[PDB]
Write a protein that binds this ligand. Structure first.
Ligand code: 2TA
Length: 382
């Protein structure tokens, strides 16, 4: 009745942010005057470190304090992040906003744990799917709004950032009076083949997060971002719509998975690597846009399948206890690969080269997972 509507409106107004599609074009513009090397190699890598640091503390804080204060914390973190994007000028200030965005992403778990904590035991997946769909629709509508406003009204990215601050303010106001849960999930004390799909999910989502962290900066290299020649809002709206319809198509089609799940996963990883190589090698911005859509759709198929083979035979209380470990492994892998690749203390690689590395990473994951299926040679050779 009431708590679900409050959470739905909070999620919609939090996710609806026209600033995010045009972030690096706004950061690498006259408003901030930040070179691409600075954002690529000093500012953005801080997000992965902040998220990895804050994952587990936020994970236990959500459980301990009954999931509402962490939602208000995410709201005030949104407030601070977008206020400091609106009124911040400096590499250190942008590292701070990256830390606060990592805090936002870490605290996002509360928005979904509160759902299980407050809804009736009769069903959880229905309201969880509605909440996820409302967040996705909010993001898509925000991207389309940003694209339309930029294209028609000639409206600067400062005004879009203002709109995002207003939206997150309304979201925080809505999260102010969420009813309190009366129970926690595992505030008490705490198959082997699941290790396969856990590794699949961890590696694929580490690659996806690291790719998304720098897709826009790659778009910046092909065409002048500070000009109006870019189409980030429409492109990212189409990308998230394609990802959503792709994740739904996996449920629309009901095929056996215990037989060809690994084959589907390796095929999708191969397509991911191909899309990344298309992004890296091409010279046209539209080819990179199409590669982004293809990669997002293929990764969404891959992760929908991987989450199915983890969640079919898992308890609802163990869903969180397993996905927390899986995303911790994913963040460990992403932080290691970022320190080796992106961070200035490592190789200081421009985004014009990072995407070859990402495509090779996906290709190597697919190849090694196929090679682990080495039992083909032993049985066939008799
Ligand atoms: C306003 C702002 C401030 N700091 C950041 N840092 C940042 C940029 C790109 C990132 O890659 C996404 C990695 N994973 C993070 C969550 C899902 C994907 C992660 C962090 N992004 C910002 N906007 C933004 C730009 C491009 C993509 C994203 S997002 O994918 O992470 N946003 C959601 C779709 C998850 C809502 C957000």
């Amino acid at each position: 009745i009431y708590p679900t509507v409050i959470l739905c409106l909070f999620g919609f107004f939090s996710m609806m942010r026209p600033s995010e599609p045009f972030l690096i074009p706004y950061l690498s513009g006259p408003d901030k005057n930040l070179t691409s090397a600075e954002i690529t190699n000093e500012i953005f890598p801080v997000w992965t470190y902040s998220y990895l640091v804050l994952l587990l503390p936020v994970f236990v804080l959500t459980d301990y304090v009954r999931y509402k204060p962490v939602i208000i914390l995410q709201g005030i973190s949104f407030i601070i992040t977008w206020l400091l994007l609106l009124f911040g000028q400096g590499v250190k200030t942008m590292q701070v906003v990256e830390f606060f965005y990592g805090m936002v992403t870490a605290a996002e778990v509360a928005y979904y744990a509160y759902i299980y904590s407050v809804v009736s035991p009769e069903h959880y997946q229905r309201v969880s799917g509605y909440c996820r769909s409302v967040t996705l629709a909010a993001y898509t509508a925000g991207s389309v709004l940003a694209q339309l406003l930029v294209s028609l009204a000639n409206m600067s990215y400062f005004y879009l950032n203002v709109i995002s601050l207003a939206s997150v303010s309304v979201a925080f106001l809505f999260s102010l009076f969420l009813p309190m849960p009366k129970k926690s999930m595992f505030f008490h004390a705490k198959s082997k083949r699941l290790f396969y799909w856990s590794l699949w999910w961890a590696f694929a989502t580490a690659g996806f997060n690291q790719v998304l962290n720098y897709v826009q900066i790659l778009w910046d290299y092909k065409a002048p971002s500070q000009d109006s020649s870019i189409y980030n809002g429409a492109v990212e709206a189409i990308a998230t719509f394609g990802g959503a319809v792709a994740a739904f198509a996996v449920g629309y089609v009901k095929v056996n998975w215990d037989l060809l799940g690994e084959l589907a996963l390796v095929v999708f990883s191969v397509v991911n690597a191909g899309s990344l190589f298309l992004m890296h090698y091409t010279a046209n911005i539209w080819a990179c846009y199409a590669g982004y859509l293809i990669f997002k759709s293929s990764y969404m198929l891959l992760i929908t399948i991987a989450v199915f083979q983890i969640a079919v035979n898992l308890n609802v209380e163990r869903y969180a206890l397993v996905f927390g470990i899986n995303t911790f492994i994913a963040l460990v892998i992403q932080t290691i690969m970022t320190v080796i690749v992106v961070d200035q203390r490592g190789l200081n690689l421009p985004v014009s080269i990072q995407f070859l590395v990402y495509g090779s990473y996906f290709a190597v994951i697919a190849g090694i997972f196929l090679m682990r299926s080495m039992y083909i040679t032993y049985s066939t050779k008799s």
